[PDB]
């Protein structure tokens, strides 16, 4: 009889999805001023008597600041050399080390290179998961969760995935410059003449309106992945969620009466991640933060 666990006065919110199955919805919010990262993760548990395995739907959202900066290169001679640092690739990952836990799905599953991204994950009673690459369809599942994020001029693709981990990467792709398209590897990307030898470092590079949101502001992630647990066995398990970025450098040295020289330092600062360690309590269906960096 007494099988829904909690403490006195808990805020336990559950969605009854029909039959002897329900969904226990939990959320956690972690911020970090050091890394400029906010993790707004939803933890939707799947209680189902017709399912012989515990299930946890993790929807990872939030915001990862672009960490873009325009600076002068201090020192004599570098009075006409300016430096731009911008994010080349955003990192979202979920890794675990519990042997009794394994990942059963993840969205996006395949590399997608459109400006907008909208995908759905559905659940039918009995342990049936299937994912549709749209937010189209009306009420085929007992419970559905969607992902939604825009990645202008970037490309979302899976980098690592197996039974204990999954890692995405939103790499830079193609940009629209006033003189045609420019690839993400064009060393002369984002550089321009600063109109004289007194302009600011900011004037040595493209305006803010020629920069996509992922370069100016940042990236709002929206990734889903589900993990299964064998009933019994382990009562608690841990996993880590990484929100990060990779930074490139684009120096723009100005030469008078001649031209503006440019060169790119690719992957100068990698793994600029904010990793948070969570712990699941499969008995009480609750999440808690163990720590972060």
């Amino acid at each position, epitope marked *: 009889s*007494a099988h829904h666990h909690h*403490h006195h006065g808990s805020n336990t*919110n559950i969605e009854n999805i029909g039959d002897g199955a329900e969904v226990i919805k939990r959320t956690e919010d972690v911020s970090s001023k050091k890394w400029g990262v906010t993790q707004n993760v939803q933890f939707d548990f799947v209680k189902d008597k017709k399912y012989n395995k515990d299930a946890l739907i993790v929807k990872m959202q939030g915001f990862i600041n672009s960490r873009t900066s325009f600076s002068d290169v201090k020192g004599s001679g570098y009075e006409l050399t300016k430096r731009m640092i911008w994010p080349f690739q955003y990192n979202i990952g979920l890794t675990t080390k519990d042997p009794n836990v394994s990942l059963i799905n993840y969205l996006p599953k395949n590399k997608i290179e459109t400006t907008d991204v909208g995908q759905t994950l559905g659940y039918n009673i009995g342990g049936n998961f299937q994912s549709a690459p749209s937010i189209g369809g009306n009420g085929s599942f007992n419970y559905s969760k969607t992902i939604s994020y825009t990645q202008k001029s970037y490309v979302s693709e899976v980098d690592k995935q197996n039974s204990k981990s999954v890692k995405w990467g939103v790499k830079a792709n193609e940009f629209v410059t006033p003189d045609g398209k420019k690839s993400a590897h064009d060393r002369y990307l984002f550089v321009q003449s600063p109109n004289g030898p007194t302009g600011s470092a900011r004037e040595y590079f493209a305006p803010d309106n020629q920069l996509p949101p992922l370069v100016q502001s940042g990236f709002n992630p929206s990734f889903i992945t589900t993990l299964s647990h064998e009933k019994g066995s382990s009562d608690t398990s841990e996993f880590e969620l990484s929100y990060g970025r990779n930074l490139d450098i684009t120096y723009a040295t100005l030469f008078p009466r001649t031209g503006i020289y440019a060169e790119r330092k690719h992957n100068a600062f990698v793994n600029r991640n904010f990793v948070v360690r969570y712990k699941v309590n499969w008995k009480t269906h609750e999440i808690k933060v163990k720590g972060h960096n």
Partner: antibody
Framework: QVQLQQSGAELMNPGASVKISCKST????????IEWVKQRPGHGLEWMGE????????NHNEKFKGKAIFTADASSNTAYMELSSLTSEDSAVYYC?????????????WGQGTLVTVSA | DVLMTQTPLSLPVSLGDQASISCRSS???????????LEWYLQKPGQSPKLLIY???NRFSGVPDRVSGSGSGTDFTLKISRVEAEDLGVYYC?????????FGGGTKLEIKR
């Protein structure tokens, strides 16, 4: 306008049933458990059970597993409890209690109580 | 479904003395989150139960300073500094960390006029 305002007095013949209310204001149930407590006149306080309304998922004590049924209506703002096979044992006062934990401070509300008399 | 054994059953106390109520659980009340969810309730006659102290020690809004609760593990104690004629009634210890929830045997506090 009292947070948990219960039903009035009641008289039901033995063997029958009765369903009492617990009209609940307070911001949002369907997320916060509401429990029921029984008090014999012999100074005995006994915890019956609770229910999460928005889910209907109940959680009761084995003593009242065959004697108490918990329901709740999200359309209005009420939760109910029904008692089967009324005997002289079940003649008591029944309170409903809600409690909210939050992070700063802590709330605990109770109802005035509903008297249930089992006679003919 | 743990047992809650209160002691004493009847505790007389004069106007100004100190009254202490012990309550011991048949299992450690510590929940997996780390907090011990023990509570003390006061039911004056003809009224609904009123909460005094939540989570062993933390006092409730509107509780006088004479009240203080302590304890650890399974044995707990509620103490009243300067007992007054308005504090009489029945005191119950309640556990809220393990379902099903259970109350205490009740402790009747009478005055000595």
């Amino acid at each position: 306008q009292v947070q948990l305002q219960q039903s009035g007095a009641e008289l039901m013949n033995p063997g029958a049933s009765v369903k009492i209310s617990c009209k609940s204001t307070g911001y949002k149930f369907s997320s916060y458990w509401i429990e029921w407590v029984k008090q014999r006149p012999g100074h005995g306080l006994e915890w019956m059970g609770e229910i999460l309304p928005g889910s209907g998922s109940t959680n009761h004590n084995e003593k009242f597993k065959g004697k108490a049924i918990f329901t709740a209506d999200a359309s209005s703002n009420t939760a109910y409890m029904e008692l089967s096979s009324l005997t002289s044992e079940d003649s008591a006062v029944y309170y409903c209690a809600r409690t909210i934990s939050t992070a700063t401070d802590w709330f605990a509300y109770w109802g005035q109580g509903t008297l249930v008399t089992v006679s003919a | 479904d743990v047992l809650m054994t209160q002691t004493p059953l009847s505790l007389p106390v004069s106007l100004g003395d100190q009254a202490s109520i012990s309550c011991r659980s048949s299992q450690t009340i510590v929940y997996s989150d780390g907090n011990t969810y023990l509570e003390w309730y006061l039911q004056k006659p003809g009224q609904s139960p009123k909460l005094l102290i939540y989570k062993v020690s933390n006092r409730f809004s509107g509780v006088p300073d004479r009240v203080s609760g302590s304890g650890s593990g399974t044995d707990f104690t509620l103490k009243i500094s300067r007992v007054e004629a308005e504090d009489l009634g029945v005191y119950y210890c309640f556990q809220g960390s393990h379902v099903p929830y259970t109350f205490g045997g009740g402790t009747k506090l009478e005055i000595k006029r």
